[PDB]
Design a protein around this ligand. Structure first.
Ligand SMILES: CCCCC/C=C\C/C=C\C/C=C\C/C=C\CCCC(=O)O
Ligand SMILES: [Fe+2]
Length: 630
């Protein structure tokens, strides 16, 4: 007598009323199709059955689930199935899939298996037929020329039910309704709404956004701290002199000497150079920054376009108040657009989707890498499709593709390439510090999982599904661009560990850092103008508060930009939380546990650090890092 346990999901529509047939597949034969008829399958419910089988099945290999339409189609989310055999064996079959009535689902037991592990027909056929199905279901498509490839789906509902997301034209509605308690006339001015809705940081930004210290602070610990790099030599396009900035320098060194000492930093928006209300794209600023005596980064010079000239002045903190202020606003404007389109959209969302699609196409559910990654990438596809389904930013993505390299996705390596690695030359870079801690924890975790399933480098290289996975990413996701630096194949356990870390870190930690600071730093519009309604100033001394108000977005229109950021504020599975148990084996369960302990240690490290800070950095606190881009 077999004891069969079927667990239904707890999503709103997890439950089904349809007919459920179940049969077992053993080495010595198959049982017949048993209708699970008693009651129905309700959300959150677990259902157990006693099933007497005719013949000896041998060792159970597979479980066949069939959903027969009963009335209208009622989608059914199956978490897992367990078996208690008459021989006393306890077998678990992970599923975590939406089941429709148009097909039959077949599950392996929870133990993770490489292709070289399966040498009997029953297992080889299932594995091969599953990939065949995957590769019809999940296909590549070019949404826009030059873009990384994404899922072949025009809309969200055209996605396989498996990767569909239960379910921001709404957010708009959310902000509006929830906001009201106000009057309809509050929408005439965003600031009328702002004081009603302020967190600690945004209120700080409203009061201090005009300060050079806060301006420079954001390049390190703001919503988009990935642009700043150490300047080893003054670019010809920026004809700044010691005399121009002497007032800012504090070490009795010339500008040139400060550069050699590694005290000069630069943010260069040449990505915005050549782009076509569109006016924000008239600028492609170069911001020069200085590490003062207190080891704080402050702006010392700003040129709003790339080509130096009489129509393109170098603005300084010694200029008229409103000259300097408007220059900074333009840099904040540029940082905002790069952050939204490049740092956020391209380098976390689209990248994660590439990994997700390649995973589904090339890795069967039983593969250890599927079990590992599925929690971090699964819903990136649906979310990206929703964003897609409802010109300058397109050009930006195209131009940034050249810079989308594998090396730039490896955190420690990326920090280094920007010359920002030194903790002692740049002590107040909290995104770096926390980033490195989290990256190291994921690196340790992935490495352990790899060592458990891959006995040595040779096993990695000879894993055909892993090789196709990597190859799909390189050829399709990254368009086979050689300069991308992505591996065509993975030949060692270390290389594999690093690659998996790239995927998980990008979808979780990196995304959290560049996403969850959006409201803190962008809710006060003047610090993050989504649009600019006037061209950059082309002369010194002519700027007035009128021109600044005319350049900034309309006060009323800003309510909507504010609403968006705040509604999004309102909203989870966090890093290390794996309630969906694809892995069922003791060794990997122990690695997961060690992962969570390493994370908790980082949580304490960060907490203790934040108490000594005037403006705490909590974006990379593992307690707040989601598993995926969700
Ligand atoms: C109900 C599910 C909601 C899912 C939300 C998923 C991700 C969105 C998160 C942040 C990104 C959203 C927008 C950020 C900035 C504004 C874009 C405005 C575009 C426009 O209007 O011109
Ligand atoms: Fe996001």
């Amino acid at each position: 007598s077999y004891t069969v346990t079927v667990a239904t999901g707890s999503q709103e529509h997890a439950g089904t009323d349809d007919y459920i047939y179940l049969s077992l597949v053993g080495s010595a034969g198959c049982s017949e199709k048993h209708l699970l008829d008693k009651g129905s399958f309700e959300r959150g419910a677990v259902d157990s059955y006693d099933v007497t089988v005719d013949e000896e099945l041998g060792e159970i290999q597979l479980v066949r689930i069939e959903k027969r339409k009963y009335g209208s189609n009622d989608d059914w989310y199956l978490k897992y199935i367990t078996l208690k055999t008459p021989h006393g064996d306890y077998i678990e079959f992970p599923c975590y899939r939406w089941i429709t009535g148009d097909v039959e689902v077949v599950l392996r037991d929870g133990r993770a298996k490489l292709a070289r592990d399966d040498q009997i027909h029953i297992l080889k056929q299932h594995r091969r037929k599953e990939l065949e199905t995957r590769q019809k279901q999940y296909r590549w498509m070019e949404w826009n020329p030059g873009f990384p490839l994404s899922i072949d789906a025009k809309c969200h509902k055209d996605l396989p039910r498996d990767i569909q997301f239960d379910s921001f034209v709404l957010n708009y509605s959310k902000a509006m309704e929830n906001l009201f308690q106000s009057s309809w006339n509050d929408f005439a001015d965003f600031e009328k709404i702002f004081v009603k809705i302020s967190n600690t940081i945004s209120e700080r930004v409203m009061n201090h956004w005009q300060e050079d210290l806060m301006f420079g602070y954001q390049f390190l610990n703001g919503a988009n701290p990935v642009l700043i790099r150490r300047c080893t030599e003054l670019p010809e396009k920026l004809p700044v002199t010691t005399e121009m900035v002497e007032c800012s320098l504090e070490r009795q060194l010339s500008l040139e000497q400060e550069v050699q000492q590694g005290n000069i930093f630069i943010v260069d928006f040449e990505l915005l150079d050549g782009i076509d209300c569109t006016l924000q794209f008239l600028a492609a600023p170069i911001c020069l920054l200085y590490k003062n005596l207190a080891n704080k980064i402050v702006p010392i010079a700003i040129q709003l376009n790339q080509i130096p000239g009489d129509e393109n002045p170098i603005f300084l903190p010694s200029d008229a108040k409103y000259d300097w202020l408007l220059a900074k606003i333009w840099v904040r404007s540029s940082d905002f657009h790069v952050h939204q389109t490049i740092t956020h959209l391209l380098r976390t969302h689209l990248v994660s989707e590439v990994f997700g699609i390649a995973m589904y196409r090339q890795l069967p559910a039983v593969h250890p890498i599927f079990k590992l990654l599925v929690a971090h990438v699964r819903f990136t596809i649906a979310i990206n499709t929703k964003a897609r389904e409802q010109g300058g930013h397109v050009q930006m993505v195209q131009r940034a593709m050249k810079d989308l390299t594998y090396a730039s996705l490896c955190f420690p390596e990326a920090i280094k390439a920007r010359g920002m690695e030194s903790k002692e030359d740049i002590p107040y870079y909290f995104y770096r510090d926390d980033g490195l801690l989290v990256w190291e924890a994921i690196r340790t975790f992935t490495a352990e999982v790899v060592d458990i399933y891959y006995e040595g480098d040779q096993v990695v290289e000879e894993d055909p599904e892993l090789q196709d996975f990597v190859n799909d990413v390189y050829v399709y996701g990254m368009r086979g661009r050689k300069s991308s630096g992505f591996p065509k194949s993975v030949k060692s356990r270390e290389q594999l560990s690093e690659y998996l870390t790239v995927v998980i870190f990008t979808a979780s930690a990196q995304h959290a850092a560049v996403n969850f600071g959006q409201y803190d730093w962008a809710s006060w519009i003047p610090n993050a103008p989504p649009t600019m309604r006037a061209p950059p100033p082309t002369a010194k001394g002519v700027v007035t508060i009128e021109q600044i108000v005319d350049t900034l977005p309309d006060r009323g229109r800003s309510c909507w930009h504010l609403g968006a950021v705040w509604a999004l504020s309102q909203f989870e599975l966090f890093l290390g939380m794996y309630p969906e148990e694809h892995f069922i084996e003791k060794p990997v369960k122990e690695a997961m546990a060690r992962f969570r302990k390493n994370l908790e240690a980082i949580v304490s490290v960060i907490a203790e650090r934040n108490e000594n800070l005037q403006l705490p950095y909590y974006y990379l606190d593992p307690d707040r890092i989601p598993n995926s881009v969700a």
